[PDB]
Each structure stands twice: as C-alpha cells, then as structure tokens.
Symmetry: D2
Subunit: 273 residues, 4 copies
C-alpha cells in the first residue's frame, strides 16, 4: 500500500540524498550498492529507525560482465540482465511493488584516446558502459515487464523512472570518452523508454547535474578554482540541490512530464573557455 | 516577508493557474492583463478574499508599439511600470513569469496586418520579456544587499514543440526562439545577483475545442491528451521554490512526450 | 546563370561569401548599408572578371522606417532587395542572410533611446529583415510558373555556434540569433513544397579585428573568412539538395569548451 | 602520396557511395565488410579497374565480442584488437590512413515490452552497441595512436573522422532502444574525440541521415506512406545525397569544422505526429 523506490548506487553522495528525499515523501526504498555495503547498511538503519520496514539493501555489480553463479558443479555465469531483473524482483518480493526507479549508479574515470592493460581497457569499457547505460536499460526492461504483468486493477498510479545524466557532456571532459558516450546512451534511453512506456503511463526523465559534491582530493586553490566557474554561486551543488529535483519529477505534480531532462548545474553549461 | 510574483497574461488559462499556484505557496501576485480585464479582476477578487491584499491587477499592451497618453509611451516604459507597480504596492518583486503571448499564423505562402503581427507576436513573446527582465534586475541591483530577497526567480513560458515548427506560425516560432536565448543569456548575466532564469515549455495544454480537437490529442504519447493548466503551473511553482535554487539557464518540457514524435 | 543575394556583402564573411558564390558561377547582388566604397570596389572586381555578374543595393535592415511616398517600412525595403534581383537578371536563386549588427546590450550597468535604437537595429538585421527577405524571396518563386523556375533554390542564414554559451552583455544580439534559428526551421518546413532549402551556418570566432584565439581547440585561432564561406557555398550546391532545416557549426570545436 | 580512407561497412548502400565518393576525390579506400564479401570484392574491383591499387577489402565482425583464435590453438581476439588491425591494414598496404568513416551499423528492434531468447538478447546488445559505438571508439583510438606515432614531418595535412549518426534519434523509433542508445553514444564520441584529437589536427564530425534508400520490403502503399512524410521532396534520400556531405566534411575546404553534426534528412526531424 506504500510506494516503492529502487535507487541504484544509493549508499552515499547523490544516491543517498535521493533515497532520503524519496523516503521523506513516504517511499519504501530499495538501496542498491556494489562496493559500499557499510554505508548502505547504515543508511538503511537510519531509514528503518524512522519508519520500520521502509528500507532494504541489495548488492549488485552493474558492470556489463557475467558474474559467478552462487566454481563448482551445477551452474552458469550470471548475466548483467539477470542481476538487473533480480534487483527489481527484490522490490516485488519484499513489498509487492516497484513504483520508482532511479538509475544513479555510475562509474567515472578517464579513458584517454591519447596516452596490465588489455584487462584495464576491457574492464573499463564494461564497467563504464554497464553502470551508466546497459544496466539502466535492463533495469528499465525488468521494471516495465513487471508493470505490464500487473493486472491494471492492482497497478500503481505514479510510475516514474529517473536517469541521472550529466548537464556537461555536450562540453565533454577531456579524456573521459567512454563515460561521455555512456551518458549519451543513457540520454537515448530516456527518450526511447519514455516513448515506448507511455502507454503504460511509465514516465521517464533525466536529471543532469553539473558540479555536485565535488571531490576535494586536490590543491584547495585548484578545487576552489574549479568551483568558481559555476556562474551561479560560484560553487558546486549540495546533494539535496540535485535530489530535490529528482523527487519533484517523481511527484504526481510532475505527471505530464516525460522524455525530458532537467539540468541542475548553476548555469555551468552556459559557459565557454 | 510575503514574496511578490508578477505574472503576465494572468487572467486565464495557464497564466491564471500559475498566479493561483504561486498564491497557494504564499506569494502576493501582480496579475497583468491586456484585454481580459473582467477575468483578471475576478481572479484578483478570489485571491484577495482568501488572503487580504494578496493580489492586484495592471493593464499593459506588451506589443512592441509606442502608445498614447489618451511623449507616446514606449514598450520599455510600460514594462518598467509593471515591475514598479510591484514595488509601489508591496515594496518588492521576487518572481517574474513571462507568460503573456500572442499566437496566430504568419504564413510565408498563401502590409497593414503584417507589421502589427510582427510587433504583437515579437513584443509579447520576446521583446516585452527582455524589458521586464531588465526592469526586474535593475530594481534588485538597486536594492541594498541587506534588504534583498533570498529567492529571486524568473520563468519564461516557452514552447516544447518549436524545434518541430507549426506550419504557418513563423513569427511566433522565431519569438519563442528569441525567448529561449533570453533565458540563457539572462541566466548567465544575472547569476551574480542570484536571479535564476529558466523556461518551461508546454506541448499541448488546455485546448479550446476548435471542433479535430481529438485529432491532436490522440498523438500525445502520454495519456493521449493535452495537459491541464496545473500540470504546467506546478512545474513553474517548483522552479520558483527554494528547492530549485541550483537550477538556472535551463528549460523543462511539459509535453507528455509529444516532442519525441515524428510524422 | 543563377543569382545570389548576399546581405552585408561589403567585407569580411559577407564578402568571402559573395566571392565564393561568384567563383561557382553566380551573379551576385551585393547589399550593404554604410560600406558603399567597399561594396562598389568588390562589385568592380567581380564585374572585371565576369561582365554583369554583380550589382550593389543599399538598405538599412534595422526594424525602422526611413526615407521616401510616406515612411518606407523594413518590409518594403526587403521586398525591393529581392525585386532588384529580378529586375536586373530576372531571378533570385540563393539568399544569404549575413548582415548583422553586434554590440552590447547589458542587463546590468557595470538610457532608453540607445536601447530602442539598439533593439530595432539588432533585432532587425539579425532576425526581422531575414524573415521579410525570406518572405519576398518565397513569393517571387511562388509567382514564377513552375516550368520557368530554378532547380536549386537555397537560403542560408548566418547564425552563431556560440549562442547557447551566451556572450556576457549581448542579450538582444543572442535573442535575435535564437530568433534566426527558429526562422531557419520554420521556413525550411513551410518552403519545402517549393523546394526552397533553408539552412544555417554558425561561425565560432572568425576574422578577429590573443586571449580568445588561444581558447579554440582546433588550431587555437579564429577562422579565416573562406573557412566559413566554403561551407555556405557547399550548402548552396546541388550536392547539398537533401539538406534543409539544419545548422552547420564552423567553430573549431569552440562550443565544446566550458569555463 | 595518395590519401587513404578507411570506410567500415563499405560493401553496399551508403558506405559504398562513401567509398565511391572518396575514391572520386583521389582517395585509396580500405573497404571493410562483415557478411557482404561478394559485394565488397566487386566494389574493390571497380575501383581498382578505374585506378590500380586504389582499394582493398578487409573483413571484421565489429560486434562487441571476442573472436578468432590462432580450429583454434589459443587466445580469443578482442574487438579492440580487430579494430586496431583494420587501421594497421591501411598502414601496411599504403603507409597511411587519413580518413576514417564509422559507417557499419546494425539496426533491428530491441523492444522493451512484450506481445534465441537470451542469446538473441545478449548478442543484440553486443552487436548493436559494438557496431554503432564501441567499435567506432576503438577505431578512433587506433587511428589517433598511429597519427600520434607519426613524426610530425611524415604526417598528413587533412586528417578527418566521420561518424554516421542518425538525424531522427531525438525522435526515437519505437522498439529500437539499443540502436538509439548506441547512436547517442556515437554522438558523445564525436564531441569527445573532436576535443581530445584537436591538438593533432584530427577533425571529428557526424553526418545524420533521416530516411535514405529506404528498404522497400513492404506493401508499396506503406513504403510510399513512409517516404511521403519527408517534407522535402516527400521521399527518402539517395546514397549520394548523403555521401556528398561526408566527402565535403573530409575536404580541406571543411578544415575548421570539428565536433559537429550535419543532418541530411530533408527536414524530416522538423516533423511532429
Ligand atoms: N556528482 C556530480 O558532480 C555529477 C555530475 C554529473 C552527473 N552526475 C551523475 O549523478 C549520479 C550520481 O552522482 P555521484 O557523484 O553521487 O555518483 P558517485 O558518487 O560517483 O557513485 C555513484 C554510485 O555508483 C555506483 N557504481 C559505480 N560503478 C558501479 C558498478 N559497476 N556497479 C554497480 N554500481 C556502481 C557506486 O556504488 P558503490 O559505492 O556501492 O560501489 C557509487 O557509490 C551519477 O550517475 C553521475 O554520473 C554526477
Ligand atoms: N497552451 C498551450 O498548448 C501552449 C503550448 C506551448 C506554449 N505555451 C506557452 O505558454 C504560455 C501560456 O499559454 P496559454 O495558452 O495559456 O496562453 P494564451 O491563452 O494564448 O494567452 C496568454 C495571455 O497572453 C496575453 N497576451 C497575448 N498578447 C498580448 C499582448 N500583445 N500584450 C499583453 N498581453 C498579451 C493575453 O492576455 P489578455 O487575455 O489579457 O488580453 C492572453 O490571455 C504562453 O506563453 C504560450 O506561448 C502554451
Ligand atoms: N565574425 C565572427 O566571429 C562571427 C561569429 C558568429 C557569428 N557570426 C555571424 O556571421 C555573419 C558575418 O559575420 P561578420 O563578422 O562578417 O559580420 P560583421 O562584420 O559584423 O557585419 C556584417 C555586415 O552587416 C551589415 N549590417 C550591420 N547592421 C546592419 C543593418 N542595420 N542594416 C543592414 N546591414 C547591416 C554591415 O554592413 P555595412 O558595413 O555595409 O554597413 C556589416 O558589414 C553575421 O551574421 C554574424 O552574426 C560571425
Ligand atoms: N539508411 C538510412 O535511412 C539511415 C538513417 C539514419 C542513419 N543511417 C546511418 O548511416 C549509416 C549507413 O546507412 P546504411 O543504411 O547504408 O547502413 P546499412 O545498410 O544498414 O548497413 C551498413 C553496414 O554495416 C555493416 N555492419 C552491420 N553490423 C555489423 C557488425 N556487427 N560488424 C561489422 N559490420 C557490421 C554491414 O556490413 P556487411 O553487409 O558487410 O555485413 C552493413 O552492410 C549507418 O550507420 C546508419 O546508422 C542510415
Ligand atoms: C585526466 O584528468 C583530468 O584531465 C582532470 C579531470 C577533471 N578533474 C576533476 O577534478 C573533475 C571531477 C569531476 C568533474 N565533473 C563532475 C562529475 C561528473 N560526472 C560524475 N559522474 C560520477 N559517476 N561521479 C562523479 N563524481 C561525477 N562527477 C569534472 C572535473 C581534474 C583532472
Ligand atoms: C494555418 O492553420 C493551420 O495550419 C493549423 C495550425 C494548427 N492547428 C491547431 O489547432 C493548433 C493549435 C495549437 C497548437 N499548439 C499549442 C499551442 C502552442 N503555443 C501557444 N501559444 C499561445 N500563446 N497560446 C496557445 N494557445 C498556444 N498553443 C497546435 C495546433 C489547426 C490549424
Ligand atoms: C562588454 O564587453 C565585454 O564584456 C567583452 C565582449 C567580448 N569581447 C570580445 O572581444 C569578443 C568579440 C567577439 C566575440 N564573438 C565573435 C562574434 C560573434 N558574432 C558576431 N556577429 C557579428 N555580426 N559580428 C561579429 N564580429 C561577431 N563576432 C566574442 C568576444 C571583449 C569585451
Ligand atoms: C517493430 O517494427 C516497427 O514498429 C516499424 C519500424 C519502422 N519501420 C520501417 O520500415 C523503418 C525503417 C527504417 C527507418 N529509419 C531509417 C534508418 C535509420 N537508421 C538506420 N541504420 C542502419 N544501420 N540501417 C538502416 N537501414 C537505417 N535506416 C524507419 C522506419 C516499419 C516497422
């Protein structure tokens, strides 16, 4: 009877803020994580403490690789598609529903054209394309099938899919090609899924941050200079300044919106060198 | 500290729903109208009944023309006077919604009406907005930083569908392209004053039953209908809320996936 | 012998476009506003290489009234431009909307008349004159009996690669270019049945009158005039006959940059 | 002395016309193919007949799969390896590669929604993404590497990369999600590679057809019905109407253009339902 949100990469930063923002609205939240088990279980505890049985954690590698079956007798590697189906399944198993999907998990590191390895280049392609593009596709598919399979009478009235894209990829970041192409893929998914799932009343939108919760592992004057180029406030956003938009888009007040993106970027994309 | 919204073309349809939506969030509302005096006054009455002194009306032709006093008055002056009306009455203006807009054909293919059409469609949709944003920014720049609002917001009502131009509506389409440029340019220049500038583009919203009505309706992917006024205004209201304080220079399409379509 | 009308033809890109079209065989109507000397000299060069292959026509393209029956509107001056082509050579196959004022209209200081002249000048040259010119052009074609019509009608609007990344203080200019982009799309749709193609070409930084230069990813300079005009010429060629309603950025990657 | 173009999926339709159009401008042309051996060899023969040693054919599956071991004896060949060998082929035979056209592309439905069912699935993802996006990336990588490796004194003066994108993908075709995502990934690559390869004076641009040489495998009236939708001419383009734009972009006349797309669609993207 309570709406259910699945949030990938939910353990920290903008994914946490999204899970939290949805939770404040009344959602039960499936918190996905890959490597951040401690932070995800802690976040779950906070949410459950405020409202019993309003959170769970599920672990999955969203890289475009087949994982190992759980080396022994009777099985076959688990495809990304299956791990994605199981994520959505986790929501139906536990709460009997899934109303909101947020595709937030994403790897982000350089793949330069101009310059051990083989494994680097192979793994990077799978990981960056998986997390940013191919997993969202399969996740959206599982999500869609399970609404299609729900008798109209038992269906939700506010199905929403949010894809976290990037406001800045038309102005690409030097050396981040695979990432950038993956976000471009994700933007196509938004449009194409919004079109094909319209008859089911599944809305599909994007939210593209500019600079948000900027990692500060660098000279302060450099961190500071990066920041200062956002026209608005001359700083990166907080997590909530992004997650609040995600929340609105999922609200029944946004039910005519589909197939679109909202940049949250402090006018950063308006800039030129 | 009641914040003040100026909404152009506020008397009916989407402008009314925006005035109402902002009113419900606590704004005092300057309702601009041109010809729809009766409807604007009635709406002001509703809002004032709910909350005393929370609404006024001001009349202005937003066409790019000079008018008379019975000095012809230029569009720039009428625009400045709109923003000034807000300061005179409540001593502030926090929100501006550029909503008023003419919309009729200017076919390229089968000089009196040509020029008045140009002035009207360009003025309402583009030039008046520019002047309004100018007046708005000047009043803020002139307010000592101590006494400034904390959530200045300008929303331009654009069009989701103008990349897929409506046949025979060239001037209108160009004016909306001009408005999109104003959104980006104003968002950049006013950032240092923390004035956010965004657009909202409806697709098909609140169709008068021109008969065919079912024709257009039926190729909106989402729901196969046009939107209600609130389905648009709610987005406007969000964009004006402090929760949307990192958003500037951008547009939100409210079109039910309509722009995703092809012939 | 096809005819091109080129607004703002006296110097810089307008001149390189006139020249580039002339080298392809076009007769060229060179429009100018103030640059009479330069336009007449250019016309002399072109006529010397090929007799009667160029003329000059003067018009303020600002959205004002000027000079006489009674005040002459922008619409009329625009019609007269296209008419000059038909009168002299009995045709007009290519239109290039190139003429364009470009100067600041700040929202924040750092009155009035300067603003109401600026509005009419920047919107007129960049957007309103183009519309009327496109209108005049389309009517002359619609009125030509089909068997007597050209086979490669082309309109090119000079837009701006960089206006999604607005130049600080240039709001009316930017809005006018956004207006011109809509004209491109709208005219391309409505004139398709007459086989009039309508496209845009957007320079980044071209022929600067260096800080800015060094910011361009490709070559770290501004373009030459020909680096822009050659694109225009291609779009006008029969090889480009399936292209309409689109823009080409000629910007050296400049619009790919961020601050 | 003679500039060299590599054209992927060159055997037929738009890729043949591109190879032909480059050939007419003086290029030697590496014509890659996958399943169309006969057409590619026949096209090579025409080009060689017209100008001796001005064409070669080379075969590669550009699907994102590992392939042809040394019956085997050993290790699987990576897509990246096959891609590098394509560009290598050009250097081995003619000592250069000036132009790369990423034209090969698979195109068939991947519906979100229902009514070889997971090999099909898996092979669709690798094939659509591979041909349309991942192989282009690796090809662009190999190409840039060989230029970077060329002493500036032995470097060509007109290096050009063209990615065949799609004018219509912002108006997505119902049921072709993966294809659409893949083209959005290719658009990312265009922008990103244009930025990163600028310092080596490698230009990187896209050309997006609307409807070109439309397959007529359907009731005439339905075929006529589809073309009739194009506002310009009410027909699909010919192959040359597309390839001539490609050729222009590669010409020295286009040397200031990089990081952009050119729609060749007859105004088709300007339409709405
Ligand atoms: N922050 C920004 O300035 C910014 C800017 C533009 C766009 N965005 C987009 O906004 C979203 C959120 O931003 P963010 O900064 O919060 O993201 P983030 O901190 O970089 O990480 C998001 C989460 O994604 C998960 N992830 C990465 N690769 C994965 C894989 N192979 N399999 C499963 N999960 C994987 C990680 O989960 P675990 O820790 O559990 O392993 C990570 O915690 C991302 O999609 C991002 O690309 C962010
Ligand atoms: N409705 C849609 O499907 C749709 C679609 C795309 C975009 N939009 C945009 O959304 C906004 C609102 O849509 P709408 O249908 O509610 O608007 P609307 O009914 O067509 O008109 C809005 C108001 O604009 C005022 N107006 C028109 N010309 C004016 C002028 N010369 N001077 C001063 N006021 C003038 C009129 O005020 P008076 O009645 O007082 O004279 C009119 O009531 C418009 O900007 C529109 O372009 C709407
Ligand atoms: N150069 C660049 O870096 C750049 C960048 C982006 C876009 N563009 C676009 O490309 C085009 C050409 O650029 P450009 O630098 O060569 O242009 P430009 O030198 O600034 O000026 C073009 C011509 O426009 C004419 N003009 C200006 N105002 C006019 C008016 N009111 N009525 C009639 N003519 C008027 C002038 O003609 P007269 O001299 O005869 O008076 C001028 O020579 C322009 O549309 C421009 O916006 C250029
Ligand atoms: N035709 C159109 O209306 C249209 C519209 C929009 C965009 N485009 C784009 O323009 C380009 C050309 O159009 P087109 O219609 O000529 O293309 P096409 O006929 O469908 O096929 C292009 C070639 O791609 C090759 N290819 C497909 N999958 C491959 C793979 N897994 N590995 C290696 N090669 C593979 C095929 O080569 P083999 O035959 O040798 O196996 C095929 O002949 C494509 O990128 C397309 O996306 C075309
Ligand atoms: C080779 O390295 C370089 O050339 C630069 C890359 C940019 N750089 C940065 O510090 C930096 C970090 C984040 C930037 N963008 C914000 C962003 C975008 N997308 C993201 N996606 C995910 N998944 N996670 C993020 N944190 C993220 N951040 C931009 C620049 C310094 C070194
Ligand atoms: C020459 O006439 C024609 O070719 C068509 C034009 C489209 N048509 C319509 O009924 C129609 C009406 C509104 C349409 N768009 C919605 C829209 C967009 N912008 C607007 N702006 C303002 N200011 N007001 C509106 N109502 C408005 N509506 C699209 C088609 C039938 C006749
Ligand atoms: C208030 O002044 C300023 O803030 C800056 C404005 C930018 N500036 C420049 O030197 C400058 C000049 C041209 C620039 N863009 C190229 C451009 C774009 N459009 C044009 N349109 C026309 N019609 N003519 C041009 N020359 C032109 N140039 C960008 C920056 C220094 C001072
Ligand atoms: C599930 O099937 C359907 O719903 C429709 C799909 C569209 N359809 C078509 O006949 C069709 C064919 C090509 C269309 N687009 C042109 C196009 C775009 N990209 C392409 N890419 C490649 N690689 N090859 C092409 N031939 C190609 N064609 C659009 C519609 C009929 C059935």
């Amino acid at each position: 009877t309570v709406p259910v949100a699945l949030v990938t990469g939910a353990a920290k930063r903008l994914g946490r803020s999204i899970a939290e923002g949805l939770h404040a609205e009344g959602y039960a939240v499936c918190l996905h994580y890959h490597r951040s088990a401690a932070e995800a279980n802690a976040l779950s505890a906070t949410l459950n403490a405020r409202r019993p049985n309003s959170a769970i954690t599920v672990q999955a590698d969203l890289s475009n690789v087949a994982t190992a079956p759980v080396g022994a007798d009777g099985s076959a590697p688990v495809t990304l598609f299956t791990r994605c189906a199981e994520l959505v399944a986790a929501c139906y198993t536990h709460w009997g529903r899934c109303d909101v999907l947020v595709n937030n998990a994403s790897s982000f590191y350089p793949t330069p054209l101009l310059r051990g390895d083989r494994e680097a280049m192979e793994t990077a392609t799978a990981d960056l394309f998986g997390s940013n593009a191919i997993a969202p596709y399969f996740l959206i598919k599982a999500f869609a099938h399970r609404v299609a399979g729900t008798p109209a009478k038992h269906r939700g009235t506010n199905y929403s899919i949010i894809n976290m894209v990037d406001a800045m990829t038309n102005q690409p970041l030097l050396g981040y090609t695979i990432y950038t192409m993956a976000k471009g893929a994700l933007e196509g998914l938004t449009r194409s899924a919004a079109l094909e799932l319209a008859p089911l009343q599944i809305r599909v939108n994007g939210v593209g941050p500019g600079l948000s919760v900027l990692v500060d592992d660098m000279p302060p004057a450099v961190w500071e200079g990066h920041r200062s180029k956002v026209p608005l406030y001359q700083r990166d956003s907080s997590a909530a300044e992004v997650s609040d938009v995600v929340i609105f888009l999922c609200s029944s007040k946004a039910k005519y919106i589909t197939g679109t993106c909202v940049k949250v970027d402090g006018g950063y994309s308006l800039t030129r060198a």
